[PDB]
Symmetry: D2
Subunit: 494 residues, 4 copies
């Protein structure tokens, strides 16, 4: 029961957000923001660059000064503000969902129920942690009194992707602000709109100027200025592993700022013969095709045991033929477009390599329509580990299905990749559930389900799928800087 | 009451330690290890390089495989082994202390009571944490059972400095092994001897082969091979901020391995007029001059309030004249040599700059002796913030004394640096103790004391003085990799 | 800036709250509820007894059954409901404050700003903890998978006092519900009104029937039925140590239910000569006289160092003469009446004993008015430890001032009591602040302040001032029951 | 591979242990200690009573004074002492195991490998926690600095049972001492010998006098003096629920001391048709018969699903016939005697009631031998919930086997008891493993195994099976007393 999407939305927030005020780009330049499904320009946004980032950083630095409103404020007041922001997102839910679907080529019903719902739940979760961030009193040797302070890291630059614009935005600012940090968020050049709208909500909630600064623009420009900035204490990034590498290097060549990364993946999904077949097929299906396959945790490597392999493929191909491509804002459409032309052509090149390397094409395998960047739901069987589509992150509606015999070889193959964001295991065996999930080198491992991500759960990947964890209890520790204070006393007592 | 140092020590362990076996360098090359105080060659050690590192990493990777002895072993057994290693250090305390003093130009009584004592205490502390590393069960949304596993990070490459050879060695392997990791330690080319001896103790304690691999050699060679290795999950480094930068970059250009850094500093030591003057002078003195000023936390910026400034200088110069330079193994000597020629000339160049920039030379200010790299205990007053000796880490027996008037300006000046490892505050005012220590941007802040570092306390710096914390409860989290396991269940209950 | 109190308040909720429905007492009996200041009857409330308690317990037991709405509900939804209840208290803030002031003889401005403000803040704090109550995964010996569940304790009977009716009510249900427990609250017979009003707000917020059951009535009847009930898993009590004893015994003679107690006190307040005199006098004043001295943490033993003793007494008597007794609802009145006649006569008898035992009467020392139970702000100097007013909890506007010479004897005297709820220390000496507070046997120790109680802080007393802690992180653990689940697995891995 | 037990053991420690010195009972009286298997007197021990307890408490109080050796000592030194005590138990392992088997009628091989092994592991676990007991720094509202201290509870009286003498002894003193408490242990009158021997080991390890005081004697005398003592801050008890009630009452009538209880049980063991039958039969067998059925967690209610019921009973009767009764010190004997005559006659009366109420006698059902208190391994099938042997704790080699059909009714029946110490679930179904264990009201729930208790796991029961948890992280919090210290500061910063 989702309301009707808005049609005539007029855009209001298109500028750079610094100190709760709207600024034009120092350069004067602007960049176009389009609708993925129709290719028509939604509006133009100020093009932030290095000089715009420098202004944002100084504002964030000033807001983090000892004695400033944001730092003397009660931790509980910090939580109340986050909850108030969630209230404003709840109010503007329809507008944000429509805007999100329009700019991101995202299905509206999902944007309204899933994305916006997660946005609200994440903020409310973060709100609760604010006055619960605690330090320790340590019984060290000698006559001393020692305690620690879980202080904020400081000025946090946060660079986010285009697949879940608003959600990624709140995933970053939620924990950061809950801990007392000041941020400089740089949204993807493809989807800055919902992020900019949040600026007005952040100002309306009552957050002190400089606590949240938003600088729209491109990556090599505004993003790089953040990663290499000498006054940014930490950079949080979510996107391609290729850029993630550049971020960590930039951090090293400059200020040695803390770095947290959430990169892509090539998540394996192992289905054993003793598993519930129906359950496995549906979860494995959604696991790869959700949001036109543009998910970090996409189950791009589906390992199925020989005895149930042929059958599993039949249902997978069957299930993949039940899609209606079109405008994500139009009722009935069950699959929208890819974000842009670059992404669209990347998926086609990979599909083509799959064909050329002997992969068995079951579904689609080509483009669709003449307006927008659509791709037919593609399925490939008899996919081998050495294949290009089995190694590289496609980030498109393309499913890979492999065959396995032994428990040991399938685990080895599942772990043979530089990625390790997530994985799925389907079995009704208690032992395989526990031991196999312990053996897989992935940040999150789902058993008899998939894609289940929650606010109270830490999320991140092993190996090259990222550094650190987000959300949950552990995620909040990534946004604090520990300080040990040791005081000499006459005589200590237990 | 310290025993007499050994004289004829014969060296036994000079090879590369891989899989509990001793290997010659693949290249065949060896490098000389000298005695800082006399300049005479102690012996020669195998020169490890990239090919030697590759062997060590594969051994560490093999020891970390699912089902291997080290990973199936009880966490409690892991602690018992660490305690057994401490027992062996306790037994070989005299040998290790003598060897440490000889190779590092370190005063024997200190090496025996302080360094070796800290070595034992650190291992015993780590031992206790082993079976106490726990995960969580998270009450997430929906019908799911979710729990986390605090798994080891994996293969950890650890690069350590020459100022506290054995202590740095155990500071790294202690937490790592306590958590279940396998390591590849690369000691400083100047001081590999005590580290190599530990190899025999690690094998004798009963640790499975491959758990600890030690590869002596140079930095740009063996060290760089570790930081850029594609199969190393994490690199832990302690040394210069210059190399720290290279480490983080290498980690980015290659595998995106986790990085923890403990770099130098320029620790400010603020003394207010209301402080206990005697206490302040002694702590501030030891804080800069300990181990010939070769400490990461050296209080190289002593800010004293005007009203007590002149008097403080007098006592400081007075105290600095009570030193006997000479062989650290000879009774009566209260100050040994610097590690090598490079370090010695770095200190002289900085002393010289202090003279040329108008700093007031109170003590020494020049070299000493003809055998070894000794330097006279130097003291400078009327030092200004812009001075080279007030900005760069000297790492030599050179003290800087500054003057301050206001509480706000002194805090600003204390924080105006890219460093932030530690700081000291001397005052009898409850409010300044708490508020000023909260305002200083340093990892550890001592009040009415200094240099007090303990095993149960997390240690690391803000800004460019490092990433992450070592030891203590927080330090052990830096050696784990969190995994979230979500299981679909029929119905959840609180 | 507090709004004008309501005058004609008509009462609506006067029945027993069970399963979100209003019930008449099974016996048919009712009991009168009066206004402390005027002695006039506000209304009549159903007199709950054992049979009414049995109905409430069965309702709470049914709401706690596996599979019931309250137990399958998301922990986050549990938090959202608590925040919604706080929203309803915010809305009915004027009504609750007026009603509280009328029924409790409590000053309106305080009831509106302090009591109701604390009510809201406590609920919001509890709300945040709901989905953050986590268990552990334990690396035990052998091949097993072990994790714990922090389950709710179950049916919690909560008996509260009359001095802070609404606040005590939320202090109990907040943590309990946040953790998933079902409760049976039994408010003081003198002040059931605001608690009953909360019933309607609890039903309106959306809490499942049976989660909160409120049974007004007397102590030896309804209260005793709760403490000795065979199906109540835990009893939380706040009141006199005399009844606390009976509660623990009842728990032993019956079901061996968990017991938490927050009893009275005789809180010492030590003022050293080096302390800020003004600060000390004001805090020490409010510490004893707040809410007509009817506070658990009342600083009923003020130890002042000889050198500043005479001067301290002058200001204390001076400050105590600035009060206007009258109706707590009338502007200008700075001191309301005692709760009832029993309490009034208890305070007089103690005041009389103070005079008879040689205590130096500085202020009042007698009753006031003819309508209501008022008492003149009394102050006594030269009070000795053996005096009755220096040993027993007065719970009235009566301050005791003592003299001390040595640091050791004052600590011994401060600890020489069966109480130990709280204490205060006034000094500008860093060492006395830390070491003396460590030496005092009190649950909460304030330094240079007093009466500062917050939601994020655990509160409880040492010795006979109570068992367990309330609020804060530790307080929430008192509302959970740990369960260890050990599963046999083929092979364990770290 | 267990060594031969000792034969001529001469007893040395038979007095009351106070202040590391051996005292005769104030009364002069002594009591005989026998060998359960032969009925011959091993020796005589001083009979401690109230006056002996008063001396022990004063010694423990004196050792806990601020500034005493035990309280100023480093937490790490406290751990080192515990590990040293474990070293001494390791050394005297043969003596303690022999002595334990002789005094407790315990099989020697088990006493040597299981009991003594657990003794050592528990101490080593506790040792590690000592310097890791930490407090918090709380970000409360307003300008204040707040931190907590996890102080020791104080003087802890500990009363232990006769079934696992030495193990219970260390289970109590381990955590207590690790946290800094001083204790007054009162071992069972039937088995004081190994506890008294520990006194010499505690003195030899270097523990300060008064830290551990041991007062042998009877329950209504020495034990009751501890539970009702006015200067004991906490009483820890393990034994019958009947005495547990008296302990909690005594605590209420006197000082309101904290109380922790570990009482008996009637642990249900549910076996579903889909479980591994062999595994289930063996675990369930050891679960009831271990140590002649004298275990708190004995699986005295074995629920087996109808479809596999008859078959399960055959194997259970089969397995129960493979026992050789005799002296626990003699090779080949696989079942020793009950502790004494009282216990022996309690088991017979229950066996008899089983016969009279229609239970189907499969095995034994009567006594054995003429020297000692032996009983034949008894098994009963077709046992109904209303039967006396299905409700009361037998504490003898008697197994009850029931039949069940539905998942819901079996859980209801498993929970229909005032006990709730532990439970066992056998099934290969992932869902039943998780959901059923969540639904059972027992402190510990084993899946596909049983009797697996470890040091790093918290242990305690729901309902009348006890209060609080022992061992593990949570268990150590039961041995601390939280203190909140709030300091007023000029301005707070996050
Ligand atoms: N933080 C500390 O405790 C500490 C310790 C030693 C040195 N320093 C500082 O650094 C200055 C110079 O000392 P240094 O050159 O011996 O220190 P360094 O940082 O070069 O040496 C530390 C360690 O890192 C290795 N290393 C060096 N080059 C490397 C490279 N390219 N890649 C990977 N690893 C490499 C070394 O071989 C050694 O094991 C000093 O004057 C002082 O300021 C600080």
């Amino acid at each position: 029961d989702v309301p009707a999407p808005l049609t005539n939305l007029q855009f209001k927030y298109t500028k750079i957000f610094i100190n709760n005020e709207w600024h034009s780009s120092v350069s004067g330049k602007k960049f176009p923001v389009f609708n993925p499904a129709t290719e028509e320009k939604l509006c133009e946004v100020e093009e932030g660059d290095k000089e715009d980032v420098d202004k944002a950083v100084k504002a964030a630095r000033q807001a983090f000064q000892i004695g400033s409103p944001w730092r003397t404020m009660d931790a509980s007041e910090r939580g109340r503000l986050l909850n108030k922001l969630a209230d404003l997102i709840e109010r503007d839910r329809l507008l944000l969902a429509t805007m999100e679907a329009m700019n991101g080529g995202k299905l509206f019903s999902n944007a309204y129920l899933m994305d916006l719902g997660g946005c609200i739940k994440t903020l409310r979760y973060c709100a609760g942690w604010a006055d619960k961030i605690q330090g320790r009193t340590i019984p060290m040797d000698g006559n001393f009194f020692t305690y620690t302070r879980s202080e904020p890291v400081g000025v946090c630059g946060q660079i986010i992707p285009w697949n879940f614009p608003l959600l990624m935005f709140l995933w970053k600012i939620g924990p950061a602000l809950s801990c007392g940090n000041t941020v400089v968020v740089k949204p993807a050049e493809q989807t800055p709109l919902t992020a900019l709208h949040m600026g007005s909500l952040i100002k309306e909630a009552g957050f002190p100027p400089g606590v949240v600064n938003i600088v729209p623009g491109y990556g090599p420009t505004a993003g790089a200025a953040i990663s290499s900035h000498m006054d940014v204490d930490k950079v949080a990034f979510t996107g391609s592993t290729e850029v993630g590498k550049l971020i960590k290097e930039a951090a090293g060549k400059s200020n040695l700022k803390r770095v947290s990364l959430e990169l892509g993946g090539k998540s394996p999904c192992i289905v054993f013969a003793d598993a519930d077949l129906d359950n496995a097929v549906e979860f494995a299906h959604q696991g790869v095709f959700y949001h036109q396959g543009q998910c970090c945790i996409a189950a791009s490597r589906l390992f199925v045991e020989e005895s149930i392999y042929d059958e599993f493929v039949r249902r997978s191909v069957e299930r993949a033929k039940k899609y209606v491509l079109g405008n994500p804002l139009t009722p009935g459409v069950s699959q929208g477009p890819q974000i842009d032309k670059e992404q669209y052509e990347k998926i086609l090149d990979l599909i083509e390599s799959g064909k050329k390397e002997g992969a068995k094409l079951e579904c689609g395998g080509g483009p669709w329509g003449n307006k927008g960047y659509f791709i037919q739901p593609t399925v490939f069987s008899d996919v081998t580990d050495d294949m290009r589509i089995a190694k590289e992150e496609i980030f498109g509606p393309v499913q890979q299905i492999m065959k396995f015999k032994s428990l040991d070889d399938v685990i080895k193959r599942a772990n043979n990749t530089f990625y390790g964001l997530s994985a799925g295991i389907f079995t009704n065996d208690i032992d395989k559930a526990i031991t196999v999930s312990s053996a897989l080198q992935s940040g999150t491992v789902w058993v008899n389900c998939y894609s289940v991500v929650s606010a109270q759960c830490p999320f991140g990947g092993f190996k090259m799928s990222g550094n650190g964890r987000e959300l949950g209890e552990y995620g909040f520790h990534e946004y604090t800087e520990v300080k040990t204070v040791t005081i000499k006393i006459s005589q200590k007592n237990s």
